[PDB]
Amino acid sequence: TTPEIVTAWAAAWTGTNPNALGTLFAADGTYVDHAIGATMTGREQISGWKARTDAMIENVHVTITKAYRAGDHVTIEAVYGGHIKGAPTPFAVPMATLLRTRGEEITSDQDYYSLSSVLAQSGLPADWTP
Amino acid sequence: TTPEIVTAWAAAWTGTNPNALGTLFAADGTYVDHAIGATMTGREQISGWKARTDAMIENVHVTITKAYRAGDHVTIEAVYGGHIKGAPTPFAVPMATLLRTRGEEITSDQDYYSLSSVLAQSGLPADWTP
Numbered sequence: 001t002t003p004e005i006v007t008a009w010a011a012a013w014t015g016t017n018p019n020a021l022g023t024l025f026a027a028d029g030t031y032v033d034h035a036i037g038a039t040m041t042g043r044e045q046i047s048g049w050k051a052r053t054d055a056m057i058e059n060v061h062v063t064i065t066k067a068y069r070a071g072d073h074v075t076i077e078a079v080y081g082g083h084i085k086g087a088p089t090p091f092a093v094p095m096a097t098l099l100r101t102r103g104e105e106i107t108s109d110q111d112y113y114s115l116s117s118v119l120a121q122s123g124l125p126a127d128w129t130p
Numbered sequence: 131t132t133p134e135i136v137t138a139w140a141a142a143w144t145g146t147n148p149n150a151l152g153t154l155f156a157a158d159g160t161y162v163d164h165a166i167g168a169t170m171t172g173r174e175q176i177s178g179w180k181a182r183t184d185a186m187i188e189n190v191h192v193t194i195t196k197a198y199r200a201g202d203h204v205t206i207e208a209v210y211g212g213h214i215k216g217a218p219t220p221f222a223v224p225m226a227t228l229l230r231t232r233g234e235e236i237t238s239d240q241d242y243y244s245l246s247s248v249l250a251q252s253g254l255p256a257d258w259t260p
Contacts (some may be wrong), residue, residue, distance in 0.1 A: 034224050114165045116244065
């Protein structure tokens, strides 16, 4: 079924502890969010990204539609939801996450989704920023 | 090592014959672009999607940076580039394409990328529509 690393990754994002995200990564792990264009390096910056995300978005949740592994590469099809603080409405958008692993740890995470969809569903202007 | 179907898929998108895209799919194959929210079903609609894309964007090209197969799933990490007609500048954005195959045919293609990056790099307003 679902690789354990995927379950853990979704729990870390859906949970309320920033360190739970960072602890899944190796010391040299990288995290890139392609919708926002943000790159984090190392466990502390990664955990900080979950913290920052929660600062701006309430009730963030990531649910797994499906995931598959090919050796040390893992692909995840997920739905990313939440409510941007102050926004008229919540959002739920499709997202793909590509992980590279080493042993039990993540060395690279890339998240692909469209920010335009998040904003549009949220009832925010298309050019909106925090 | 890149699956043959991946090379064909990229050539199809990068060439000018729109039918090159639909020929790669099974009769019941589906195509979903998550950035635009467009769903196409069957060969005729899929080839029509390449034609529609070419009508609004010149020099459409998809470049493969990596691809890996897990059973009937194939994950592609790519760069989608081109130049929206009338835009002051071109674009090149990271994209993830998730394919499902049956034999040598594609039964599913889902494309994940951020429309906002495409528009911003193009010099276009975030609410731009064709």
